[PDB]
């Protein structure tokens, strides 16, 4: 009775083992192999955050729990998850070819990043669709953004409320909430890319829901292309706000990220923590969504809304 549909779950990708780091960052750096000192530094960072292998496992669990949950909560469609990644196998093109090979004719896609950008989401969506077109007989409907899904907002609102409630009274009245996403080159503005506006809306929605009146928006994890990247960076922002108003606690919500990956476990929990430690402020960073049931239900809702179900 049920209609079969592919569920294409797309993400940046993460290395699967230490020996993957070289090829992974080469791919990110557009063919430019990192120098030996950069490779060793990267290996050290991954060791510092508890190792590499749990990273890719999170994406796999998110895709599979999403598949199973979608299949449980409605009775019209049977979904089959396929993971397509940007910077490591299985690549996006590989996943589409496999759906096509398995006889899938209709699919829905979603990127594991809630905010639309021309650089990331649009590019993944275009690549998926071009491959489907090249093969023929397979169509894909693509989710473009989902930062504004109530259930996803609620996830972060609830985590923020819990954090502020755990604070001693003096920190609670002198805390600052920093809401962030991965920086992109500023030149996306040339196309009217709504990515920065969507991060600001994410921050508004989360702060409002949590009852937090003092918050700011920052960016993190900028690459090293020559042209300017979106700022301010979370490290500079933290220090600027501290020098400005003397906050005693900083709460970091990297809403652009969905998992315990390097850019959270290192770029927040180490790099921002260095700054808060230096200024004598408390550091808080609530749990990332990962594959938790509340997050999986939000993602399932997004997918079913996109399909008009
Ligand atoms: Cl959409
Ligand atoms: Cl959008
Ligand atoms: Co990055
Ligand atoms: Mg080894
Ligand atoms: Mg929308
Ligand atoms: Mg960095």
Tab-separated table of N, CA and C and ligand atoms in Angstrom, residues 116 144-145 198, ligand 2:
chain	number	residue	atom	x	y	z
A	116	UNK	N	19.673	28.216	5.247
A	116	UNK	CA	19.995	28.210	3.817
A	116	UNK	C	21.196	29.099	3.562
A	144	UNK	N	15.073	23.491	1.862
A	144	UNK	CA	16.085	24.557	1.701
A	144	UNK	C	16.566	25.123	3.036
A	145	UNK	N	15.657	25.255	4.003
A	145	UNK	CA	15.994	25.677	5.385
A	145	UNK	C	14.939	25.166	6.368
A	198	UNK	N	19.008	34.671	8.413
A	198	UNK	CA	18.429	33.478	9.048
A	198	UNK	C	19.113	33.171	10.374
B	2	LIG	CL1	15.062	29.227	2.803
